[PDB]
Subunit: 140 residues, 3 copies
């Protein structure tokens, strides 16, 4: 199996003005098999270069937000996974938010972590905020 583990590079992000369309992008590729995965640095996309059965996972560290914190893991712009937290307006929620799932992908398909449009702050520390995949094998 080929793998990729992408880590945030540190520094806090406010989702509204510190990102465009909510998409996380400045990922550090500490592990990436270049024959199976390609990273797109501005669009924040993790592209698969071959058909396969893929396990996909992510985790975003919510560090303070208004009331509703959430993101989607999208595949070709389509919601596949979601991780969501809540809090009462005036109070604080520091919270790692992990989700993961398995799906069949064809070559060139692109995966991305997209924050929902809200006032939400996230910490990009490498241990709390990450994004990865495992090609478990061929697709049927």
């Amino acid at each position: 199996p080929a793998v990729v583990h992408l880590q945030g590079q540190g520094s806090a992000i406010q989702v509204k003005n510190d990102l465009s369309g909510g998409v996380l992008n400045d990922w550090s590729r500490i592990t990436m098999n270049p024959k199976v995965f390609k990273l797109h640095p501005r669009s924040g996309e993790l592209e698969v270069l071959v058909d396969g059965t893929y396990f996909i996972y992510s985790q975003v560290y919510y560090i303070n937000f208004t009331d509703f914190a959430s993101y989607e893991v999208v595949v070709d712009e389509k919601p596949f996974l979601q991780c969501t937290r809540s809090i009462e307006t005036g109070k604080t929620n520091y919270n790692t938010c992990y989700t993961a799932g398995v799906c069949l992908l064809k070559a060139r398909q692109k995966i991305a972590v997209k924050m929902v449009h809200a006032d939400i702050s996230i910490n990009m520390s490498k241990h709390t905020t990450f994004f990865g995949a495992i090609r478990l094998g061929e697709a049927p």
Copy 2:
């Protein structure tokens, strides 16, 4: 590796009165290997057809509860995994609860996601509530 990723059928559920024994059901079967896995949609049970080493995972999107929200991933009615949340707010508790783990299984054993009996609502959207398994290989 044979995999299965069951997605909810796009509906908000009130656990107490909309499920039987808290068991999430009416799963949509997008990707399921028919030689390893068999689905029982109304029961909500996922049956393994062959012995093996299985990674099992699940997410439930909690959308309303005032006390506790908890579920168990059960194998023949025995708890294997458990995901739990207490309230994050006095208003509306939007919160996804993911859990996963590896276990050995025998043929004809059945897995289910079983809510604890309480005043809980859930969003059964395809990207928010899901239930899957990976046959990594044989069991030793």
Copy 3:
């Protein structure tokens, strides 16, 4: 693929004690490929016995906490993953805290679950608190 699923053996721990630097060691070794994995019962370290690509996961059940509840998954004492909850609610909080990720490892390296030192309680039940890994295959 070689797997390991370690489960807590029940009861609870008061994290304020800071025994063994917060490193959890209550692990029951239910499934463990002995050719790839070794558990040290006193230190709580999970040692890989061969080089390879490893998916590592953990869940800790925070049962009584008020401010920050956090833990790290460490590799040779170096943080790799982190799971964190500080939910300001006015009452005591109860959350399971799952995280996971993939990394390449050499033989003899040791993985542990290290609680950050806090006056919280964690429940060590076998269904709510666990620690595991999948050797996906050889590392490139």
